[PDB]
Amino acid sequence: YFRVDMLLNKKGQVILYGPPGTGKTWIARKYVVEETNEKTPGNKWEFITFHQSYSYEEFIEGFRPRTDNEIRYVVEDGIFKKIAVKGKDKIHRLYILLTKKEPLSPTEYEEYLRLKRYLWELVGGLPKDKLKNLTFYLIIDEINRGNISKIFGELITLLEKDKRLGGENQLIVRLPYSGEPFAVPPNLYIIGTMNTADRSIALLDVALRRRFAFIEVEPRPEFLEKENLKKIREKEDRKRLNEKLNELFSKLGNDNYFLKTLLEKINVRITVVKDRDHRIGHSYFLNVETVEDLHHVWYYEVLPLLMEYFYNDWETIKWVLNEKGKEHGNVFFEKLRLTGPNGEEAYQLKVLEGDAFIGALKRII
Amino acid sequence: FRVDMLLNKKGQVILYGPPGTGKTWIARKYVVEETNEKTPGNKWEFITFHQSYSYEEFIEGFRPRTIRYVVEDGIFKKIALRALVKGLFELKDKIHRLYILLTKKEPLSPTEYEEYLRLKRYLWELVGGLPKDKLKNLTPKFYLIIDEINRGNISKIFGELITLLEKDKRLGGENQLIVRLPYSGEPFAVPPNLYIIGTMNTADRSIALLDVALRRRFAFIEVEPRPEFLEKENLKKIREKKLKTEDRKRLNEKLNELFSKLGNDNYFLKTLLEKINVRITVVKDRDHRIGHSYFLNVETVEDLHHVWYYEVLPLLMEYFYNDWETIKWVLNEKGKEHGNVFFEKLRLTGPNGEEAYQLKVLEGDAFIGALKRII
Amino acid sequence: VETVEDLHHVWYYEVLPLLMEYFYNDWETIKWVLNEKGKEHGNVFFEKLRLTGPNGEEAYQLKVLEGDAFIGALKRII
Amino acid sequence: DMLLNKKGQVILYGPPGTGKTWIARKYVVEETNEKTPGNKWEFITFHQSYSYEEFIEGFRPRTDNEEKIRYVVEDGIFKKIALRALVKGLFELEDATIGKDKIHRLYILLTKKEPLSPTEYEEYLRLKRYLWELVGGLPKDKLKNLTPKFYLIIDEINRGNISKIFGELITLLEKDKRLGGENQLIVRLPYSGEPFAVPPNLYIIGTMNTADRSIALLDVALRRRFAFIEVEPRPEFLEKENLKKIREKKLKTEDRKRLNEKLNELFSKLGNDNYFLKTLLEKINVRITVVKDRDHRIGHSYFLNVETVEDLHHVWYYEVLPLLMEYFYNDWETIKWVLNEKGKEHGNVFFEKLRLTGPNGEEAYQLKVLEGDAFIGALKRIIS
Amino acid sequence: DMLLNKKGQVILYGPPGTGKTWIARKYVVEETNEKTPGNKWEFITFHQSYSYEEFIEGFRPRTDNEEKIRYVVEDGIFKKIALRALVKGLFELEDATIGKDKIHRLYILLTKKEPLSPTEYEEYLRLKRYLWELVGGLPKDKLKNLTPKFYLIIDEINRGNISKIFGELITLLEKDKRLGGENQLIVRLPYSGEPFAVPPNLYIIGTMNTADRSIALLDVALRRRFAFIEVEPRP
Amino acid sequence: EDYFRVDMLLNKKGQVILYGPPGTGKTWIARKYVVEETNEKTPGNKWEFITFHQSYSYFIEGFRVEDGIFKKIALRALVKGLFEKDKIHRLYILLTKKEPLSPTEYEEYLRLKRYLWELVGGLPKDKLKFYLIIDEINRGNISKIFGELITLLEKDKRLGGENQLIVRLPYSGEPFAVPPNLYIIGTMNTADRSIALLDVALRRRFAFIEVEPRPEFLEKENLKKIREKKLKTEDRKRLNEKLNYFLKTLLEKINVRITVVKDRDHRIGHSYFLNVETVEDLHHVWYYEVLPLLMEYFYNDWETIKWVLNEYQLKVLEGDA
Ligand SMILES: Nc1nc2c(ncn2[C@@H]2O[C@H](COP(=O)(O)OP(=O)(O)OP(O)(O)=S)[C@@H](O)[C@H]2O)c(=O)[nH]1
Ligand SMILES: Nc1nc2c(ncn2[C@@H]2O[C@H](COP(=O)(O)OP(=O)(O)OP(O)(O)=S)[C@@H](O)[C@H]2O)c(=O)[nH]1
Ligand SMILES: Nc1nc2c(ncn2[C@@H]2O[C@H](COP(=O)(O)OP(=O)(O)OP(O)(O)=S)[C@@H](O)[C@H]2O)c(=O)[nH]1
Ligand SMILES: [Mg+2]
Ligand SMILES: [Mg+2]
Ligand SMILES: [Mg+2]
């Protein structure tokens, strides 16, 4: 927890990077209750997932008139930047910001906007050190999936700790679309989740890495030791899963470290034949109760992902599975009975049930 | 059974494989009994992806009013809100007015535009306080079938569904999340009520599903070509169907006379498709095999001639375009030319040394003898 | 087509620009289609240029025909 | 002309110096009796920026004082041309006088309206008129083939994408697919939705370079619609009897005599050989044909403007010799051979060996200028 | 100079550092009596992103009552200069074309500054639409002897795709198929179909650099039109 | 060093090339030239670190903050010298606004180009500081960034010579003026041969005085003559606690190999030798920038690959014996 709680005020923000299967979305949804204690993410902690069709919606933008003929700048993320000083106007400002209904009361916008025009001089007439300290968190899931030079024009420079509210070298810039000039608070911190298996640098922006930190949180098989596994899933049915996972490993040969060493020996074979970002994460094995569901997640989730990885490359898939050239017997893929004119050799997918499926998983270790 | 377990455990199922296998058929067959309805519109919606879908027509986009523009909900947002408001019945006045606005297939009034826009303020305020042990069990079930899912830009279409479609991140899960949509500022989540089914073709690598993250959300079940169904006993059962009219029994002697002009080998079309598909797996990928649907409604020996010469031989001539030594190896006639063969070598020889064949329309008992020899 | 001029107009304006676009600057291949590969300086469609390239190149030229010399080039194809 | 009446359309192709565009324009002015574009005479030049929307039908944002004048499909140049012939040929039919003032007087004044006027009541009138034209556009197939002719010139057809700029026309421009043909076809258009067909009234003449193999007619099914008349470079034109014949017919201001004097001495200066220019071009052409493509041959248009010897010296050193250096860049020998000075490295040589060599051992040559009767001399050597 | 009166277009080839761009405008100023690139002596520098739409005609957004949805066809640099030369030349003419009310409106119009009025553009169209049928009915006798000569400089012509930037100018730039040649041609513009040709009093002077051979001019056909003069770096 | 030869040949060529390989003390001696005399320590104007990001619709184009963040220094390099008359002092009121401009008075903001059309032609040409350097120039395509830049910047084709040259741009014109005081060099280098001298015709605008990394920067009286610039908080003589031809037999023992068959302008920097102070940091000179940094560069070539040490499992030994 030491690298989790206060490795955030050093820089502006930080992105969680890793292959799929690593719960970066889950580990960003854990600090929302360990630091903000907001089980409902409506106030003081927001959650948006970026995608390739999001623009003029992380700032202020001219939207339609509130049920008229024909027209006002609607804000959608400055509402989380005007949300970070009371700890009557500002004291009630937060509800105007958290306006669940149409917040456009015939005059509610109006009260809100003027209150904004003062801020810029209420802080503009205020010194530095009183808000250098402050007693929020916005999560952008799949941050690489949106155009960072379109959702932010020239505004990701303003999230650094020096260019925020309470710094010596800190400024405010007039917002386009008739927005009072804006700046970012220092207590506003961004936790992002990124996928690196698609590309090692997916969002290839120079100003992204110079204002965000990166962490390569690895697939941890240590989370598959049966003892380790029960510590996740028990937090009337805390005991019904106990004999379920006990007889799971008992059919598996009473081995607690089975699914741990199955994953890491496969992932180290993928790391040789493919990139290191192509490792299989650990979430594919958390919802495993019986060997039937292990057989299901093997045959219907990770094997066609592996066949996608190596396509028509029977040798590579066989080697990663450790068939290692076995052409018959308990083999996931079995060589066909024909050989082509120029040396072509082919294999077919075989279904393995019973004890022949577990022992075929033993030869991959 | 493979489909109902995985659609309950993972929340999303993609059926993959070569064409001709029942991926689209088993999608309809699964939902016409779990809904007990043969027409979509209620508890059931069937769409089909292509490259002209968008996020704006799948979740929400700005559409003009016949008033400048308004945000209308896409097909997934209509059925996810329908699945949630149906599940909030048996778990009550205003949400009954909300369900009748979503099911209102006629267009909606401008007075009822902001009436519908006001009722989902109440619903998303409601589910933010209801505990995670009530929304997990909803007594109806909703199904959306996305046929040909790899023919559209899925990550652009599935805007916020990358985070939402996970089982524990649905409504009533251990990690239940509610995301604010960037259009209209409205909060949204997907219930555990709605189960999505996808169908895809593995033949086209151009449309291949290479997104690992999207792959984790769904469970992939492959419907393989099964030549076993082409056996006389099984093809008689596969043709014994909803057509239970006088032509039940009269179709079987047409099947009996057809195999009687094939040597009464009841495993002939099974061995024909099996020996062919294992040869396509060698010289090309496994995902270019012939599907069993090409040989289902064949009843006469002329009907097989229509299948063989007009569907699969022009398709095999496109796999191996101007590659005669490969296409005659699938038909086990590499060294055989100038005989009872599908392609006969032109007598002339190329100036620089080239040599090539011409397809011959083998008809009559000749046709069967060029098919047996493939076994 | 019904005249000998009409078949001369199909050959010299439609199919010979087609074959010279098929095998562009490939003279020994296109003369094999008319089986006149070793046959130069006659009633041929492509006559051999007397000039020869410095590093060994050889070129041809399209010859126009009319009358009884035309059909002998056609029976040469048969 | 014979191919134009039988195939319906002819693409003229060859090296650039041959007279392809000129023959096209001369033929059109003579047949139409119209020496100006418009009134049944159309000239266009295809380019990559050309589009199906521009040629046949596309949505055009036409802005007018009144709002919403835009957001209206605009028929393209070809469609306008097909219409303006169709219904002008519908202005005279034997005893099938259906309407006879609609097809003769509704939208000939609208389609050939030189003021591009979006008269919003009359624009709708255009549309109503077209639909009737189409139903009565099938009065009877037999009398369909009898109208007055119209013509369009597409220059540099290779430069544009014919497969895209021309769309449904690939099916239609075939002659029997036109109106009154043995297999008549009427097509449905995507944007406006109005039906469309080409008549035998409209003829299309195309111009094409084949020295550029990038813009080449690789569309083999598209070649079946057209007819290809290869105009080789006729060096026979550089002869004095023709050089005068093709250079004075239009102008009769007594400038013919001056040209006669100008070239009479010219030939006299050139060994009194009236074939000297012809030989230069022909020898050069055969030589170019061997070492490179035959379509990179020099055409006669470079040498038709020669009236004095000093005019021809500007043609060699500013048009012909810089063209040959682009054929063979740092390929000195091939240029040297085409001038029949293959190994010569001396005076009376266009390219001269540079003495130094690369550490890698490479060698180079230098172009040298030549002038006077002395320069006239090197030309004959290429012959030898 | 003599090559401009015969070929029409000259291209001053040479490597970088040669006096190619400088004498391109040194010869231009002394043959138009205009020190500044005003009516004549216009200057254009190509680049790799230069387009056909900027050169002849294209769709551009314009503000009519500050509404940006109005997209109207904008005439390019060449269209404007070619039109200006022709209109000034038509200033001297017989009775059919003697009346200069319309001619002066059009010429001043091209001569005008950047602003194009919502109410100015339509008058330009009326005059231009007239202008085609007037010169279409005018004989080819007076049209070859246009007195005021216009000139255009194209710098760095190797940078752009000249075969794409030149459109219909593959045809119209030859001297015998300008307005008043033996084979006079007039073409229809692509956007909305307006008639257009080049009068003989407009002359183009290019400037090429042979270092970038790969995207240097490769269209052999385009070469016949223009004349070529090598410029070696004479010290 | 080089601080006494450069200040005498500025009005001849305008821009001079003093080339060097990447990594060495080059990106500070560039910052040396702008801070020492004028001491302009403010951004936005005349003191901006500048390396382009190779993204260009690209003499000036690439529209939308309109065209470029620093696309108007060529006028301003003489405009402050051409201000000695509301016309004379209106340029500076808008350009000292670091804010986006309002649409309330847009027509008044772009109406000022009207008077100076023929005044700058009537301006005396000998009436004549600001520095904008291009970095990351040859990393991307230099032919894309070089439009009409090569002919305009030479010796006599400025305005201070006899050869007269104006500029031309579309979209409402706006021709500007050119001084010889302008400082736009651009880093000329060959760290990648794919783009290096792609425009081989570069003759009459530059020269080549090679700036090798100075080998005399390793002596005990010459190591940290340069290395004290950064110190501010009492660090001038903390390094007098551990000093009690030292390490010169490290550089020319390696950087004479860089020239023979090795590529010359892939040299290693001495900016990493900035603050060698303690006794623990004596591992980074033989095991970090000597042996592994020169190992995996030849094509499995032992001579290039095995030449790591001048002063399988990787062997371990510490440098005291
Ligand atoms: N308790 C716990 N559950 C985990 C952990 N990692 C994965 N999980 C399980 O799987 C999920 C992990 O988050 P996950 O969905 O894998 O991250 P993600 O960022 O969405 O993954 P992706 O979107 O980048 S493919 C959780 O919902 C939980 O069910 C972990 O470290 N702890
Ligand atoms: N009864 C029965 N019919 C089947 C079965 N598999 C396929 N069919 C029949 O095959 C035909 C086509 O099957 P279908 O599911 O539509 O292929 P597909 O999924 O579209 O394949 P594609 O999408 O890759 S082109 C239909 O007539 C269908 O009923 C099966 O298992 N049982
Ligand atoms: N009078 C006359 N002139 C001819 C003849 N052949 C060519 N010319 C002249 O040659 C020149 C070019 O001919 P033209 O037909 O315009 O070439 P083109 O097809 O346009 O050439 P391209 O470069 O675009 S591929 C013109 O001056 C033309 O008049 C001919 O037979 N008679
Ligand atoms: Mg995630
Ligand atoms: Mg299907
Ligand atoms: Mg032409």
Author numbering:
A (entry chain B): 198 to 267, 270 to 283, 288 to 290, 301 to 348, 351 to 450, 455 to 584
B (entry chain C): 199 to 264, 270 to 294, 301 to 584
C (entry chain D): 507 to 584
D (entry chain E): 202 to 585
E (entry chain F): 202 to 436
F (entry chain A): 196 to 253, 256 to 261, 274 to 293, 301 to 344, 350 to 465, 476 to 542, 566 to 575
Can I see the authors' text?
In parallel, we also determined the structure of TgMcrBAAA in the presence of GTPγS by X-ray crystallography at 2.95-Å resolution. Symmetry-related hexamers abut against each other in the crystal lattice, deforming the planar arrangement of the six subunits in each molecule. This produces an “open-ring” conformation in which the subunits at the loose A/B interface are significantly splayed apart, and the small subdomain of the F subunit becomes highly disordered. The individual TgMcrBAAA monomers, however, adopt the same overall conformation and organization of nucleotide binding, as is observed in the cryo-EM reconstruction. The distorted appearance of the crystallographic hexamer suggests a greater flexibility at the loose interfaces, which could more readily be influenced by crystal packing forces. The asymmetry in the ring also explains how crystal packing forces could induce and/or sustain the open conformation observed in our TgMcrBAAA X-ray structure, as the loose interfaces likely have a greater propensity for flexibility resulting from the fewer stabilizing interactions. Our cryo-EM and X-ray structures of TgMcrBAAA reveal that Arg425 is not only important for stabilizing Glu375 in cis as predicted from the previous structures of E. coli complexes, but also interacts with the phosphates of GTP in trans.
McrBC is a two-component MDRS that in Escherichia coli (Ec) restricts phage DNA and foreign DNA containing methylated cytosines. EcMcrB consists of an N-terminal DNA-binding domain that targets fully or hemi-methylated RMC sites (where R is a purine base and MC is a 4-methyl-, 5-methyl-, or 5-hydroxymethyl-cytosine), and a C-terminal AAA+ (extended ATPases Associated with various cellular Activities) domain that hydrolyzes GTP and oligomerizes into hexamers. Biochemical data suggest that stimulated GTP hydrolysis powers DNA translocation, allowing EcMcrBC complexes bound to distant RMC sites to interact and induce cleavage on both strands. Here, we present cryo-EM structures of an McrB hexamer and McrBC complexes from the evolutionarily distant archaeal species Thermococcus gammatolerans (Tg) and the well-characterized E. coli system.
